[PDB]
Amino acid sequence: PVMADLNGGLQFVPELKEFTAKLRKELVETSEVRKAVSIETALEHKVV
């Protein structure tokens, strides 16, 4: 019987769980803050 590790090396990056859970927790921040800052400046531009 053979095993065939077609894994890119993801057994080496250590503590991948939150290493993963951080990469996306940042992609929602950088996404949502540029959702909120963008709409209010566009809203700022509507009161001046």
Binding site: E40, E44, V47
Partner: protein, 80 residues
């Protein structure tokens, strides 16, 4: 700077309404005979309340009282 405080934040309103209004009194006062006694005290010699050749000049009902007298009387109507 208020808009961004309107929808983002609240209004720290120091005025807090009571649950149910409670009436204190319903009273009556009397506008003076003439506006001369008040006009001499307040230093307000405004000829709209004493003279008649002026209230009629300003299309007014007549030699009206002083509004400030009306305020002070109602305030006195309250302190008691």
């Amino acid at each position: 700077v208020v808009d961004f405080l309107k929808r983002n934040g609240s209004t720290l309103e120091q005025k807090v309404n009571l649950e149910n209004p409670i009436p204190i009194a319903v009273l009556d006062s009397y506008t003076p005979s003439t506006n001369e006694p008040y006009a001499r005290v307040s230093g307000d010699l405004n000829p709209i309340h004493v003279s008649r050749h002026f209230a009629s000049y300003a299309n007014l009902p007549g030699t009206i009282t002083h509004g400030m007298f009306s305020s002070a009387s109602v305030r006195a109507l309250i302190e008691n």
